[PDB]
Amino acid sequence: KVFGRCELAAAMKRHGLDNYRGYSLGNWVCAAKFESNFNTQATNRNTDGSTDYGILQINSRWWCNDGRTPGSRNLCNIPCSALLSSDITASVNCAKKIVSDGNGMNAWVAWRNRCKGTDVQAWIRGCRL
Ligand SMILES: CC(=O)N[C@@H]1[C@@H](O)[C@H](O[C@@H]2O[C@H](CO)[C@@H](O)[C@H](O)[C@H]2NC(C)=O)[C@@H](CO)O[C@@H]1O
Ligand SMILES: [Cl-]
Ligand SMILES: [Cl-]
Ligand SMILES: [Cl-]
Ligand SMILES: [Cl-]
Ligand SMILES: [Cl-]
Ligand code: NA
Ligand code: NA
């Protein structure tokens, strides 16, 4: 599924990401935009052979099991394919674990490079939330 911006904002808000660990909703929407272009089916292969999955491009090196990232962890205890669902619950719940792990949203490269320190509230501007 390719979410609309506000649709995703609303979904993320309903799933408790607004101000989760102090990260306002726009951070999450911004991260999703630049990680996946709001596409839950996005996958990208990393140089180390892991793959990033889903709307928040959660990687299989650490967070999910895709059966083809040897020596990786599965800290979200999910098949990576669960992160591709049109239902973002699995991504959100895993993202909550990630962002809780001490490094905040810096785990999301795109967030660090494209959202962090920007006016992320713009990403939820106009949305009914
Ligand atoms: C939370 C999450 O999974 N974020 C992804 C990053 O982990 C991806 O970065 C890449 O992650 C792999 C596995 O840890 C690293 O081996 C690789 O060096 C790293 N790539 C970069 C440029 O840092 C990122 C890839 O675009 O996608 C999500 O942000
Ligand atoms: Cl868009
Ligand atoms: Cl915000
Ligand atoms: Cl694996
Ligand atoms: Cl959902
Ligand atoms: Cl933080
Ligand atoms: Na990425
Ligand atoms: Na894994």
Q: Which of 58, 44, 4, 8 lies closest to 28, judged by CA?
A: 8
- Sheet of 51-53: strand order equals 43-45, 51-53, 58-59
Query: Is 7 assigned a catalytic role?
Result: no
- If one counts every other C-beta atom within 10 angstroms of the C-beta of residue 68, the result is 12
Q: Which of 41, 42, 62 lies closest to 50, judged by CA?
A: 62
Can you give the CATH number for the domain in which 107 is found?
Answer: 1.10.530.10
What residues contact residue 104 under an 8 Å CB cut-off, 6+ apart?
A: 21, 22, 23
Domain containing residue 13: 5-124
Name the DSSP class of 78: S
Whole-angstrom distance, CA of residue 75 vs CA of residue 60: 9
What residues contact residue 33 under an 8 Å CB cut-off, 6+ apart?
A: 5, 123
Active-site residue among 7, 18, 48, 52?
52
Annotation-wise, does 119 bind a ligand?
A: no
Whether 77 maps to a domain, the answer reads yes
Tell me how many domains the chain contains: 1
88 Cα–ligand 5 center, Å:
4
Tokens for 100, please give them: 């809780």
Whether 129 maps to a domain, the answer reads no
Read off φ and ψ for residue 30, nearest 5 degrees: -60, -45
Whole-angstrom distance, CA of residue 67 vs CA of residue 106: 26
Resolution (A): 1.5
Residue nearest to ligand 1 atom 10, measured at CA: 46
